[PDB]
Design a protein around this ligand. Structure first.
Ligand SMILES: [Mg+2]
Ligand SMILES: [Mg+2]
Ligand SMILES: [Mg+2]
Ligand SMILES: [Mg+2]
Ligand SMILES: [Mg+2]
Ligand SMILES: [Mg+2]
Ligand SMILES: [Mg+2]
Ligand SMILES: [Mg+2]
Ligand SMILES: [Mg+2]
Ligand SMILES: [Mg+2]
Ligand SMILES: [Mg+2]
Ligand SMILES: [Mg+2]
Ligand SMILES: [Mg+2]
Ligand SMILES: [Mg+2]
Ligand SMILES: [Mg+2]
Ligand SMILES: [Mg+2]
Ligand SMILES: [Mg+2]
Ligand SMILES: [Mg+2]
Ligand SMILES: [Mg+2]
Ligand SMILES: [Mg+2]
Ligand SMILES: [Mg+2]
Ligand SMILES: [Mg+2]
Ligand SMILES: [Mg+2]
Ligand SMILES: [Mg+2]
Ligand SMILES: [Mg+2]
Ligand SMILES: [Mg+2]
Ligand SMILES: [Mg+2]
Ligand SMILES: [Mg+2]
Ligand SMILES: [Mg+2]
Ligand SMILES: [Mg+2]
Ligand SMILES: [Mg+2]
Ligand SMILES: [Mg+2]
Ligand SMILES: [Mg+2]
Ligand SMILES: [Mg+2]
Ligand SMILES: [Mg+2]
Ligand SMILES: [Mg+2]
Ligand SMILES: [Mg+2]
Ligand SMILES: [Mg+2]
Ligand SMILES: [Mg+2]
Ligand SMILES: [Mg+2]
Ligand SMILES: [Mg+2]
Ligand SMILES: [Mg+2]
Ligand SMILES: [Mg+2]
Ligand SMILES: [Mg+2]
Ligand SMILES: [Mg+2]
Ligand SMILES: [Mg+2]
Ligand SMILES: [Mg+2]
Ligand SMILES: [Mg+2]
Ligand SMILES: [Mg+2]
Ligand SMILES: [Mg+2]
Ligand SMILES: [Mg+2]
Ligand SMILES: [Mg+2]
Ligand SMILES: [Mg+2]
Ligand SMILES: [Mg+2]
Ligand SMILES: [Mg+2]
Ligand SMILES: [Mg+2]
Ligand SMILES: [Mg+2]
Ligand SMILES: [Mg+2]
Ligand SMILES: [Mg+2]
Ligand SMILES: [Mg+2]
Ligand SMILES: [Mg+2]
Ligand SMILES: [Mg+2]
Ligand SMILES: [Mg+2]
Ligand SMILES: [Mg+2]
Ligand SMILES: [Mg+2]
Ligand SMILES: [Mg+2]
Ligand SMILES: [Mg+2]
Ligand SMILES: [Mg+2]
Ligand SMILES: [Mg+2]
Ligand SMILES: [Mg+2]
Ligand SMILES: [Mg+2]
Ligand SMILES: [Mg+2]
Ligand SMILES: [Mg+2]
Ligand SMILES: [Mg+2]
Ligand SMILES: [Mg+2]
Ligand SMILES: [Mg+2]
Ligand SMILES: [Mg+2]
Ligand SMILES: [Mg+2]
Ligand SMILES: [Mg+2]
Ligand SMILES: [Mg+2]
Ligand SMILES: [Mg+2]
Ligand SMILES: [Mg+2]
Ligand SMILES: [Mg+2]
Ligand SMILES: [Mg+2]
Ligand SMILES: [Mg+2]
Ligand SMILES: [Mg+2]
Ligand SMILES: [Mg+2]
Ligand SMILES: [Mg+2]
Ligand SMILES: [Mg+2]
Ligand SMILES: [Mg+2]
Ligand SMILES: [Mg+2]
Ligand SMILES: [Mg+2]
Ligand SMILES: [Mg+2]
Ligand SMILES: [Mg+2]
Ligand SMILES: [Mg+2]
Ligand SMILES: [Mg+2]
Ligand SMILES: [Mg+2]
Ligand SMILES: [Mg+2]
Ligand SMILES: [Mg+2]
Ligand SMILES: [Mg+2]
Ligand SMILES: [Mg+2]
Ligand SMILES: [Mg+2]
Ligand SMILES: [Mg+2]
Ligand SMILES: [Mg+2]
Ligand SMILES: [Mg+2]
Ligand SMILES: [Mg+2]
Ligand SMILES: [Mg+2]
Ligand SMILES: [Mg+2]
Ligand SMILES: [Mg+2]
Ligand SMILES: [Mg+2]
Ligand SMILES: [Mg+2]
Ligand SMILES: [Mg+2]
Ligand SMILES: [Mg+2]
Ligand SMILES: [Mg+2]
Ligand SMILES: [Mg+2]
Ligand SMILES: [Mg+2]
Ligand SMILES: [Mg+2]
Ligand SMILES: [Mg+2]
Ligand SMILES: [Mg+2]
Ligand SMILES: [Mg+2]
Ligand SMILES: [Mg+2]
Ligand SMILES: [Mg+2]
Ligand SMILES: [Mg+2]
Ligand SMILES: [Mg+2]
Ligand SMILES: [Mg+2]
Ligand SMILES: [Mg+2]
Ligand SMILES: [Mg+2]
Ligand SMILES: [Mg+2]
Ligand SMILES: [Mg+2]
Ligand SMILES: [Mg+2]
Ligand SMILES: [Mg+2]
Ligand SMILES: [Mg+2]
Ligand SMILES: [Mg+2]
Ligand SMILES: [Mg+2]
Ligand SMILES: [Mg+2]
Ligand SMILES: [Mg+2]
Ligand SMILES: [Mg+2]
Ligand SMILES: [Mg+2]
Ligand SMILES: [Mg+2]
Ligand SMILES: [Mg+2]
Ligand SMILES: [Mg+2]
Ligand SMILES: [Mg+2]
Ligand SMILES: [Mg+2]
Ligand SMILES: [Mg+2]
Ligand SMILES: [Mg+2]
Ligand SMILES: [Mg+2]
Ligand SMILES: [Mg+2]
Ligand SMILES: [Mg+2]
Ligand SMILES: [Mg+2]
Ligand SMILES: [Mg+2]
Ligand SMILES: [Mg+2]
Ligand SMILES: [Mg+2]
Ligand SMILES: [Mg+2]
Ligand SMILES: [Mg+2]
Ligand SMILES: [Mg+2]
Ligand SMILES: [Mg+2]
Ligand SMILES: [Mg+2]
Ligand SMILES: [Mg+2]
Ligand SMILES: [Mg+2]
Ligand SMILES: [Mg+2]
Ligand SMILES: [Mg+2]
Ligand SMILES: [Mg+2]
Ligand SMILES: [Mg+2]
Ligand SMILES: [Mg+2]
Ligand SMILES: [Mg+2]
Lengths: 45, 272
RNA sequence: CACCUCGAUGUCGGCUCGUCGCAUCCUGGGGCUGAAGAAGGUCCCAAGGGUUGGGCUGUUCGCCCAUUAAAGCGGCACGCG
RNA sequence: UGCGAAUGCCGGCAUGAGUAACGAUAAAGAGGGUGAGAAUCCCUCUCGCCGUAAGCCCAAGGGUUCCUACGCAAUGGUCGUCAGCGUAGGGUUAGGCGGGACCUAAGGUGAAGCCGAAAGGCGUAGCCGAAGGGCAGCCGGUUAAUAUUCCGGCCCUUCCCGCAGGUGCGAUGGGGGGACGCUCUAGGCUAGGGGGACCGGAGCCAUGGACGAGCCCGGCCAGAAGCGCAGGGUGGGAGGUAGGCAAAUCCGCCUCCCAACAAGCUCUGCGUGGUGGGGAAGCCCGUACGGGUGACAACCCCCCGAAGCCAGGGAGCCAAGAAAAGCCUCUAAGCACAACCUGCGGGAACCCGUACCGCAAACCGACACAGGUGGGCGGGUGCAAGAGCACUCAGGCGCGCGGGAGAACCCUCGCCAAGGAACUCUGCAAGUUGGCCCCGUAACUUCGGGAGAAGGGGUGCUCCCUGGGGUGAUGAGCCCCGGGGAGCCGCAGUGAACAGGCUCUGGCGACUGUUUACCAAAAACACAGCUCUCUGCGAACUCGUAAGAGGAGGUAUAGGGAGCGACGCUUGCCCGGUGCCGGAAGGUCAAGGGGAGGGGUGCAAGCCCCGAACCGAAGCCCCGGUGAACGGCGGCCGUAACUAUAACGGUCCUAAGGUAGCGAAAUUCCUUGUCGGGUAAGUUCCGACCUGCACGAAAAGCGUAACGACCGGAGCGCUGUCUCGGCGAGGGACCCGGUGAAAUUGAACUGGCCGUGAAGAUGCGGCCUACCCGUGGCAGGACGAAAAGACCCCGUGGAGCUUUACUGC
RNA sequence: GGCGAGCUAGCCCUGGCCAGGGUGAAGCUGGGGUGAGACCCAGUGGAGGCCCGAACCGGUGGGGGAUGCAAACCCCUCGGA
RNA sequence: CGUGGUUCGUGGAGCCAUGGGGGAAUCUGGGCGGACCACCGCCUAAGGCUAAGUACUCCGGGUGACCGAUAGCGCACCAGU
RNA sequence: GCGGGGGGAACCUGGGGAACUGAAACAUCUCAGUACCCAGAGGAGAGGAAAGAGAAAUCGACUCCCUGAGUAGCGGCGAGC
RNA sequence: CGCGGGGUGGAGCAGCCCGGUAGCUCGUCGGGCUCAUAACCCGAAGGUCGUCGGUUCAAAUCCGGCCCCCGCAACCA
RNA sequence: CCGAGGGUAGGGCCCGUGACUGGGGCGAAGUCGUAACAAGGUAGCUGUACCGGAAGGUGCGGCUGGA
RNA sequence: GUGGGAGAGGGUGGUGGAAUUCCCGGAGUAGCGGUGAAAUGCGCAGAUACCGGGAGGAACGCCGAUGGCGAAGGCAGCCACCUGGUCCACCCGUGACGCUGAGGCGCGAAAGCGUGGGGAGCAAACCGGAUUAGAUACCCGGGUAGUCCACGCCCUAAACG
């Protein structure tokens, strides 16, 4: 029955995408955090 | 006016439809049409600021002429009387001798083929816009400006009108459709006649869905909520108000006068 | 009353399945009778077996219909999820 | 720094146990092949399942899963020689398909501008943004694997340049157009389908008959111009002109003059068209798959016929139905040795996608998960129709454990003597009914309904006669709708499959609708409709610190808040309290104003500090209004010429003392009230009475046709619900082979009784009973498991909610 | 202080979908009627939060499932269409 | 007047700062020594800059009555995987 | 023409700024100008050359350590600071 | 049982707080007016304060018990 | 074939009876009031409408069968 | 037919003055109102009486009558438009074309009803003050439907001469 995850590639880059993150000060700190931790991926692929 | 229906369904027994025999325009509208951004009652934050709106037919906005003082002296033939979805009233199409077209909100009695004109000139006749100062005391009028040059504001709803009761200095006294008595400036335009399509107020919506066509979504009683939601929310069965009757935001809704006290406009008001 | 159980002993009634007690409803045996007979009354012995089908109510119970030898009363975590 | 406990933490390994289970009951059998090994891989045959799909095509999403070679550790619920698995190699070809060097939508973003402590919010134009608009490719062949992409044939588009001819050319500016709903729908086509005695074709005559006007198979596809047929769009000329934010010769508007029509002009569909291409059954060939032949294949008539096309078609209706570019026209600066237009010719034509899965073993669901997933195609026969049901085509599948046995018991299913609701909270469940045609059809009603009311009859096949349509010649054929007559067979003719049981009578809700995703679908919410109230427009109101925005590009016939909730008849009295409304007076009142009068200090001038009267808002007080505002709407005692009762009276209280209607009720405690009805019997139900614990008029009163998967009561019909069970089917359970979990678990060498014990003992006492160990079974006990009781209390634990609790904002 | 409306709720923009039957509103036409009308009767017409019912959307009752095929499923039945 | 800073929570409440109102002077001017007045002192506001002594540890080095693969960093191993 | 923009472990200044908690309840008070968010700076940052201190005719910028001192005070004169 | 209010001439009510002399309306009785009754007018009588104790000088009054009465309560279970 | 009738289902009319309920007629001396007849002590009546223990009262209009 | 009359006869649209009420302005003070007599009510928050302005609805004084018109119900300021009946004179035309009238159809005071509107004065119901034994009445103060208009119903009457 209809579950929670319904992938669509546009939505994803539109939402967790790199340019998305950089617009909001909130999101820039996500990048700042993810970088500082050494995340191999700052952002979903 | 007022089409009725044999009860071949429930709600067809009570439904009542407007009379369109005044209308000459069939469907189409003159491309003085422009598109309407439907709000859903939502403001520029995505936030509902007016409840229970949305749904309902797509509509094209017919742009309509609420200043008649551009075309001063230039007359016009009344070309068509048309249906406008954005208002209770009907619009009349005007072909100016200028070659220009405008929509006027259509007065009661105004015929297709009449000549109309607007200005300090002009007969006192149905359709004719004049400064208020030149309209003879007692004539009933619609589409009035409140301040000069700012556009018609008062008596635009189907069937409404206003009456000129008197002059005092640069102002005249009008009786508004509310029955309030107001000084308006003499310089303000007005256009003689009542608005008409006055049978409008007797339409019987008749079924739920017909409210849904006009973009009115179901309206829910505070009485039917819980207290998180509304001052009436709560308490076992039914239950009375338990307090002086309130809005959802908690102010009192029987009698509490809400007009701001110190409004400058108060110097120019006299009534209910 | 507050003693085991609140780091859980599922609670009425029904149904199914019973088993026990006897202060015995019936059947068997008795004494007394204000026991003519038949039919009762009361009390004693007796737990082997039996102890109906419906209407009403969630009901237990009760009331009622129609029968019956009789339409027993209790206990078993108000027996038994 | 020493562990045995913390439902401790991490790991390991046990128990349960060779137990449950191995994931849809569509289903399998055999022969051959391969290999170390075969139920499970390959190939043949036979059998079964899907077929508005379980077949095919597209979009998401996935991302090599694709094709092939070698391979079986693991993954695969068994096996595996196979694979969606390991290794390796190969494989996706575009000016026309999709997207981008085009447009705009919501929204986003944003030169200007506005706001905000910072971060940042907003915002005109512009810009971004498509499954909308615009735009040029069709048929066939080819690969192991791609093809509108390669190839073959036939067509087309835009840029660049040149030639020729035309013309005031020229735009991001002006104008036209693009450009629009819902329902119904005409004519003509097309896709698609059926039939053919006609045309083409390998073969076939079995088992009793048939060499036949037999059986079987096939009878098309694409195509520029031109041409036909059907449709779409559209007036032509002049004069005036002040409007379309400059200017226009354009468009608009007034006048005149011809057309009224597709006549013309133009555009599209379809047909035909030079050419090109396909082309069955069957037999043969070794593939895992295809290839040869059939073949010089035929290539044609009739009929059905779209929801598709012609398309901006038509009609009706109200709820009144995007935008911008492409496109055409008009002019502007400008340039008019430019430029643009038309034709022809040569050249130029970029980026990304393209494998494969795609109702699923490749997507979302930890799984090769019985769930979920948008668009298109979806054949034939029959049944009234159909995308329904059954069976079938093409195509695809038998669901990745099997073999046996034939217990209990479970599930899904079939039948049943007599009875027929006696079952039970309740006919729950299951039966009955069931499609179409005809007869027929009540109370009541808002006149529509109620209605499929109810209850009935028909229903197949054969021959005969005969009516109307469609297409065709008015004709035959083909197709559609029938009408009458005589017969035939069976238990039965909607012969299988899909396919209402019905009636009476209450409650609640008018109605269709909505809801607690995952225990409530309802009497709850909503609803049209009624009332009150607010709001004069920079409206009230809401969101935001603000700017801004919604309201609304609306204007009192409008907008907001509130209650009530179709409709009918109605909706009484109380304004003392609270709320709101009104009230220029008076009372009280903050800061401030005002300073009588006092004080500190200094030699003083002075500096400094208190400070009464008085003048001072809103608010409250006070006066009054207000009931579809919050709300409220009596008590005791007497009294009629039998009795009872009390129309009547007395008296106390109140702001006023409950009107109509209704009433043991979704409300009545006593209560199974009393009486009546229905029953053999009725705590329910219907009717009535009134002693209403504790009904009562917009938290509406009392009714109401129709409606309801609501809740009550009764009858008929019919039943395995029951008396009361029986038999049968299949899937499990049992047995054998394969693979093989789980909660739980102080350790166990773990009996009954009567006692005892922290009061319910396998474990203590006394007696009794009892050889060791299993398997299928039942659930009485281990105060069985699960979940650190959800109830209850306790904690100066928490949190949601309220208000005339406190304190703030 | 951030992350979430790829689930779910509402709205906005833009597309798509709803086999097949049934009932027969207004209107129109004709006829009757009248002084003229209202009206009546036919035929036509094709309305509706109209009827039956697939797709689609649901989730009524019962059964099964309950270490499930499934952390909401399957069968029968049923509502809207 | 309203507030903040200080040990100072309105207190006898000054000092430093400043949102609001009124609003000066230039040495004989002004601020301060804890309400205010006198006296006696201290200091010169409404412009700006200024090493060092100080904080820290991504980084390199040296040491340890620091750990020794359940420890020590989450990571001794291709781990922010 | 020159510059700015962004990053940096912690450390620094500035703009803003909590609650649990403590008070064995709780409002002032505490936690705390902490956490945190924002701007900015640098290898440090801040501060700095008296309109100071504050009782001595005293001392002389600023920062940092020790001490003064849990003193003076502050305080529902409570907790505590 | 629980809690609050009560009990006073024939009726219905004050008085009880706050000790000392029981009031009001109606009713009853005697008279008047009327032909008569009712209305009306002038006079009058009538209660030991539910009951039993106690307190005080003095108790309807303040306290206790018992007795009837009205109201509220009886929840989680 | 038709057919007496029997059956099954649904209508219509009539009669009888029914808890209860509506009024009505009647009945030597009940209770409450006094509406009408004499300006009947508010002229009367009247259609209607609201109200009220009851007669009735009141509104609007009408009549004289009143002044 | 022709020519002439009188008329509150009907429908529609306009229009005038008096008065009542409310509001605004003025002046002005201690009561006004009301009755059998009062009381409620109103009034020093400035009432009543007086004047000026304004708003709004209803009804039309004198003329007016013992009058006129209409089938009846009914019809009354003035103006215009449309329109019914009626009578007189002339003696012109048709040639009995007549009467009445069950059914039908239409009209039909007031009150009442529906949907809108309008609402000054009046006033069922209702409240209050007096009266009374009571007073759900009579008198007084308030007062909502209604009275008014449009459309559509109801169809009654001491609709009587
Ligand atoms: Mg997940
Ligand atoms: Mg996408
Ligand atoms: Mg999306
Ligand atoms: Mg990397
Ligand atoms: Mg936003
Ligand atoms: Mg819609
Ligand atoms: Mg509502
Ligand atoms: Mg609720
Ligand atoms: Mg919320
Ligand atoms: Mg609230
Ligand atoms: Mg409430
Ligand atoms: Mg509840
Ligand atoms: Mg309640
Ligand atoms: Mg409630
Ligand atoms: Mg108002
Ligand atoms: Mg205990
Ligand atoms: Mg317990
Ligand atoms: Mg347990
Ligand atoms: Mg015995
Ligand atoms: Mg005997
Ligand atoms: Mg026995
Ligand atoms: Mg029962
Ligand atoms: Mg009982
Ligand atoms: Mg017990
Ligand atoms: Mg028990
Ligand atoms: Mg159970
Ligand atoms: Mg084991
Ligand atoms: Mg076992
Ligand atoms: Mg087993
Ligand atoms: Mg098994
Ligand atoms: Mg399987
Ligand atoms: Mg299986
Ligand atoms: Mg098929
Ligand atoms: Mg993809
Ligand atoms: Mg995957
Ligand atoms: Mg791979
Ligand atoms: Mg493969
Ligand atoms: Mg393997
Ligand atoms: Mg395996
Ligand atoms: Mg592979
Ligand atoms: Mg190409
Ligand atoms: Mg763009
Ligand atoms: Mg923005
Ligand atoms: Mg696009
Ligand atoms: Mg497109
Ligand atoms: Mg293209
Ligand atoms: Mg191809
Ligand atoms: Mg030129
Ligand atoms: Mg074809
Ligand atoms: Mg043969
Ligand atoms: Mg054929
Ligand atoms: Mg071939
Ligand atoms: Mg069209
Ligand atoms: Mg553009
Ligand atoms: Mg491809
Ligand atoms: Mg699909
Ligand atoms: Mg697959
Ligand atoms: Mg599988
Ligand atoms: Mg699946
Ligand atoms: Mg999967
Ligand atoms: Mg779905
Ligand atoms: Mg689907
Ligand atoms: Mg069929
Ligand atoms: Mg099917
Ligand atoms: Mg049977
Ligand atoms: Mg039977
Ligand atoms: Mg059933
Ligand atoms: Mg009936
Ligand atoms: Mg039938
Ligand atoms: Mg046959
Ligand atoms: Mg023909
Ligand atoms: Mg069937
Ligand atoms: Mg059916
Ligand atoms: Mg009931
Ligand atoms: Mg309902
Ligand atoms: Mg109702
Ligand atoms: Mg329905
Ligand atoms: Mg919803
Ligand atoms: Mg609900
Ligand atoms: Mg639910
Ligand atoms: Mg829930
Ligand atoms: Mg439902
Ligand atoms: Mg449910
Ligand atoms: Mg209503
Ligand atoms: Mg605000
Ligand atoms: Mg705005
Ligand atoms: Mg707007
Ligand atoms: Mg309601
Ligand atoms: Mg009321
Ligand atoms: Mg009353
Ligand atoms: Mg009140
Ligand atoms: Mg009051
Ligand atoms: Mg009040
Ligand atoms: Mg004052
Ligand atoms: Mg002062
Ligand atoms: Mg004041
Ligand atoms: Mg008052
Ligand atoms: Mg009551
Ligand atoms: Mg009762
Ligand atoms: Mg009863
Ligand atoms: Mg009750
Ligand atoms: Mg009862
Ligand atoms: Mg009974
Ligand atoms: Mg009853
Ligand atoms: Mg109410
Ligand atoms: Mg009712
Ligand atoms: Mg329902
Ligand atoms: Mg429904
Ligand atoms: Mg059975
Ligand atoms: Mg079997
Ligand atoms: Mg024991
Ligand atoms: Mg032992
Ligand atoms: Mg021992
Ligand atoms: Mg057991
Ligand atoms: Mg516990
Ligand atoms: Mg607490
Ligand atoms: Mg969404
Ligand atoms: Mg479809
Ligand atoms: Mg239809
Ligand atoms: Mg429907
Ligand atoms: Mg249906
Ligand atoms: Mg279900
Ligand atoms: Mg303090
Ligand atoms: Mg000082
Ligand atoms: Mg200073
Ligand atoms: Mg100093
Ligand atoms: Mg100093
Ligand atoms: Mg200086
Ligand atoms: Mg520095
Ligand atoms: Mg280091
Ligand atoms: Mg290790
Ligand atoms: Mg480690
Ligand atoms: Mg080791
Ligand atoms: Mg680790
Ligand atoms: Mg800071
Ligand atoms: Mg705190
Ligand atoms: Mg604390
Ligand atoms: Mg504490
Ligand atoms: Mg606490
Ligand atoms: Mg602090
Ligand atoms: Mg820097
Ligand atoms: Mg430095
Ligand atoms: Mg500095
Ligand atoms: Mg501190
Ligand atoms: Mg007397
Ligand atoms: Mg004494
Ligand atoms: Mg409770
Ligand atoms: Mg016969
Ligand atoms: Mg017969
Ligand atoms: Mg009288
Ligand atoms: Mg009298
Ligand atoms: Mg009298
Ligand atoms: Mg009288
Ligand atoms: Mg009455
Ligand atoms: Mg009265
Ligand atoms: Mg009369
Ligand atoms: Mg006249
Ligand atoms: Mg003659
Ligand atoms: Mg009438
Ligand atoms: Mg009338
Ligand atoms: Mg009025
Ligand atoms: Mg009175
Ligand atoms: Mg009185
Ligand atoms: Mg009056
Ligand atoms: Mg009559």
């Amino acid at each position: 029955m209809k579950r929670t995850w319904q992938p669509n590639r546009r939505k994803r880059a539109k939402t967790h995408g790199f340019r998305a993150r950089m617009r909001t000060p909130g999101g820039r700190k996500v990048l700042k955090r993810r970088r500082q931790k050494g995340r191999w991926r700052l952002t979903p692929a | 006016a007022v089409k009725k229906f044999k009860p071949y369904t429930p709600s067809r027994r009570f439904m009542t439809v407007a009379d369109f025999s005044e209308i000459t325009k069939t469907e189409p509208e003159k491309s003085l049409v422009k598109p309407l951004k439907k709000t859903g009652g939502r403001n520029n934050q995505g936030r509902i600021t007016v409840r229970f709106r949305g749904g309902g037919h797509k509509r094209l906005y017919r742009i309509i002429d609420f200043k008649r003082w551009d075309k001063v002296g230039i007359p016009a033939k009344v070309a068509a009387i048309e249906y406008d979805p954005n208002r209770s009233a009907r619009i009349a199409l005007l072909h100016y001798v200028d070659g220009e077209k405008r929509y006027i909100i259509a007065p009661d009695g105004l015929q297709v083929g009449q000549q109309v004109v607007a200005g300090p000139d002009a007969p006192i006749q149905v359709g004719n816009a004049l400064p208020l100062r030149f309209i003879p005391v007692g004539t009933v009028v619609h589409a009035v400006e409140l301040e000069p040059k700012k556009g018609a504001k008062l008596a635009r709803a189907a069937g409404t009108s206003a009456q000129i009761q008197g002059r005092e200095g640069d102002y005249v006294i009008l009786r508004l459709p509310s029955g309030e008595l107001r000084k308006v400036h003499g310089e303000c335009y007005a256009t003689v006649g009542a608005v008409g399509n006055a049978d409008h107020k007797n339409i019987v919506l008749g079924k739920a869905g017909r409210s849904r066509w006009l973009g009115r979504r179901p309206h829910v009683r505070g009485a039917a909520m819980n207290p998180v939601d509304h001052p009436h929310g709560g308490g076992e069965g039914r239950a009375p108000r338990g307090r002086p009757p309130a809005s959802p935001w908690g102010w009192q809704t029987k009698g509490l006068k809400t007009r701001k006290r110190r409004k400058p406009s108060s110097r120019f008001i006299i009534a209910r």
